[PDB]
């Protein structure tokens, strides 16, 4: 199995997240449909972990954006859905 968790705060400040997501770019557009970005109350930071290898920039909103290099075969971010605008990414493999 492969999941990797991730810790942001959402309401404007980063983005909320504290939880394990299997893909890391797939559940990027998806996690913030529901809570990675409030949308009323969402941001755009660098969403790492320390201690082990966790870091995900990217901006978490809900608008239509488009599909960013998400790879995610169940449903892209090119949609009306949750803003995802990408930024380098480097996580423990």
């Known amino acids: 199995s492969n999941t990797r968790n991730f810790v942001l705060r959402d309401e404007d400040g980063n983005e909320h997240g504290v939880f394990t997501g299997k893909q890391p770019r797939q559940a990027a557009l998806k996690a913030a449909n529901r809570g990675s970005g409030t949308k ?54």
């Open 40 to 93: 009323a109350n969402p941001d755009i930071i660098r969403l790492r972990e320390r201690g082990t290898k966790k870091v995900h920039v990217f901006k978490a909103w809900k608008e239509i954006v488009d599909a960013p290099k998400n790879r995610p075969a169940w449903m892209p971010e090119k949609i009306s859905k949750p803003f995802v605008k990408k930024e380098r990414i480097e996580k423990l493999e």
